[PDB]
């Protein structure tokens, strides 16, 4: 029987929930019979990314409605969907190709979670929670509610909830100080860089077994760059509600998880509209998407030498931008040092 703190055990319990993995695939209309969770594979997912890129150009340079049919049917061959005996829907536009790329992003992280559960050894004398905790290669400590870290973090959640996202409010349940194995090694070249900020990153619960094990990764080469607004990089935000939206919680699933990572932004290449870039202009370390609203730059405070933009939301003085709030994108996975993990209770007023 495990000796870990109860919050850590409850975190592991849902991080490795097989039923939550099966439900997330059902959410994507995936045929769990022809595509079981045990038969998930990087080779199969990468091929689907590749065919999804085929539909990209044909949609981009306007192909006839029957030329798309073969490429669309091609994608369903690789990723089996459940539509019975009727035709699956056509992937004829750019919105339907990014929705199927978002699924592949989560299928890749779900594959890692199940791969850890089926790999390795089993020992009936050992706690399953203790066994699965060791597979994350991550030291997880419970931050004291009475501590100074918790006060700064609670203020971050309290102050950066956007009015546009007022259909719910956030209640901090647990705060975790996380340390990934070998991550501080990776973060050494950017350890003392300028413009280091503590930013949010939200994701589905079924993604976190892969995030804590392999880190926040960047999409494989086969993924269509057209789907991501600012290209293939790791995206962050300074508003907690913006990142909490990607937890994809609901009334029947009101518990979500969010990250607080140290991102070395450096000299930010600021943009206002989409830019599916591959490389960065020389001298730039990151991309910032300028938003209509920004946290108060005079309310910035420092936590362990890192700047926390927990100021109240105010106007940024930027006209003709496609973003209501800021985005931060880095394109090297070594510029991210994950620091905190929060258990959020979504109280929906909807
Ligand atoms: O970071 C991202 C990413 C996330 C978003 C949405 C998003 N979410 N959350 C937030 O807080 C947030 C904050 C601001 C803006 C946007 C977001 C948009 C494009 C992105 F590139 N990734 C893509 C998925 N993905 N898939 C893998 C792998 F390796 F498994 F294939 N790695 C990744 C990493």
UniProtKB/Swiss-Prot annotation:
Coiled coil: none annotated. Changing residue 210 to S: Does not affect DNA-independent poly-ADP-ribosyltransferase activity. Disulfide bonds: none annotated. Interacts (when auto-poly-ADP-ribosylated) with AIFM1. NAD(+) binds at residues 201-203, 210, 217, 243. It comes from Homo sapiens. It comes from the Eukaryota. Changing residue 224 to G/S: Does not affect DNA-independent poly-ADP-ribosyltransferase activity. This is Poly [ADP-ribose] polymerase 1, processed C-terminus.
């Amino acid at each position: 029987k495990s000796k870990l703190p109860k919050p850590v055990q409850d975190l592991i319990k849902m991080i490795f929930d097989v039923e939550s993995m099966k439900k997330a695939m059902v959410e994507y209309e995936i045929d769990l019979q022809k595509m079981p969770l045990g038969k998930l594979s990087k080779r199969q997912i990468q091929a689907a990314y590749s065919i999804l890129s085929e539909v990209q150009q044909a949609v981009s340079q306007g192909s006839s409605d029957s030329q798309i049919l073969d490429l669309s049917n091609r994608f369903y061959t690789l990723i089996p969907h459940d539509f019975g005996m009727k035709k699956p829907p056509l992937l004829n536009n750019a919105d339907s190709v990014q929705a199927k790329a978002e699924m592949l992003d989560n299928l890749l992280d779900i594959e890692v979670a199940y791969s850890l559960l089926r790999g390795g050894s089993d020992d009936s004398s050992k706690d399953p929670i203790d066994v699965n905790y060791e597979k994350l290669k991550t030291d997880i400590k419970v931050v004291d509610r009475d501590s100074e870290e918790a006060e700064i973090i609670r203020k971050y959640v309290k102050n950066t909830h956007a009015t546009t996202h007022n259909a719910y409010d956030l209640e901090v349940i647990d705060i975790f100080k996380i340390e990934r194995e070998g991550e501080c090694q990776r973060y050494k070249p950017f350890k003392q860089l300028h413009n280091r900020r503590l930013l949010w990153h939200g994701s589905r619960t079924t993604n976190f077994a892969g995030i804590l094990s392999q880190g926040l990764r960047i999409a494989p080469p086969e993924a269509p760059v057209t789907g991501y607004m600012f290209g293939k990089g790791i995206y962050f935000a300074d508003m907690v509600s913006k990142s909490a939206n990607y937890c994809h919680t609901s009334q029947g699933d009101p518990i979500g998880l969010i990250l607080l990572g140290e991102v070395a932004l450096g000299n930010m290449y600021e943009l206002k509209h989409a830019s599916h870039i591959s490389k960065l202009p020389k001298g730039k370390h990151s991309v910032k998407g300028l938003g209509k609203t920004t946290p108060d730059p005079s309310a910035n405070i420092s936590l362990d030498g890192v700047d926390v933009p927990l100021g109240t939301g105010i106007s940024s003085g930027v006209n003709d931008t496609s973003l209501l709030y800021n985005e931060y994108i880095v394109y090297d996975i070594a510029q991210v040092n994950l620091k905190y993990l929060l258990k959020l209770k979504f109280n929906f007023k909807t």
